[PDB]
Amino acid sequence: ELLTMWFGSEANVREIFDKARQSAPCVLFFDELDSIATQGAADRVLNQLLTEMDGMNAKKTVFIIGATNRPDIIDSALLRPGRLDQLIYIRLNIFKAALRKSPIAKIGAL
C-alpha cells in the first residue's frame, strides 16, 4: 500500500501519517512490513517511513504498531529507540469463541 505509484515528501506515506494526526488518539497498524528488504525508489519509502516515525514521541497521544513473520530481512533501523521500543511474539491451544450459533449443531481434544 505504501508502494503506491503516488510516492511523489507529502506522498501517500505522509498523507497516511497526517491522516492519523488529527484523529486523537489513533493507532497506526502496519502489516506486510516484510517488504523492508531488497528483492529506482526500491529501498526508498523505508527511509521515508523512518524519518516520519520520530517526532511522534512528543505527540504522546499517538502509537505505532507493526507486524511481520520473518524478523531477519527487516532492517534493524526501526528497532532503534523512538522508532520502536518493544517486541511481542505471536499456553498450548487456547479457547476460541465461534459465532453463527443459529445454523450450528452440537472439541478441545482435536
Ligand X SMILES: Nc1ncnc2c1ncn2[C@@H]1O[C@H](COP(=O)(O)OP(=O)(O)O)[C@@H](O)[C@H]1O
Most distant CA atoms of the chain, gap in Å: 57
110 binds, among ligand X, a second copy, none (CB under 5 to 8 A by kind): none
Instruction: Decide: is 96 part of the binding site for ligand X (CB under 6 A).
Output: yes
73 binds, among ligand X, a second copy, none (CB under 5 to 8 A by kind): none
What is the rounded CA–CA span in Å between residue 16 and residue 23?
Answer: 11
Q: Is the dihedral of CA 9, 23, 85, 68 positive or negative?
A: negative
User: Closest distance between a second copy and the C-beta of residue 4, in Å?
Assistant: 6
Site string for ligand X, 65-94 (x = CB under 6 A): ---------------xx-------------
- Residue closer to a second copy by CB (options 43, 106) is 43
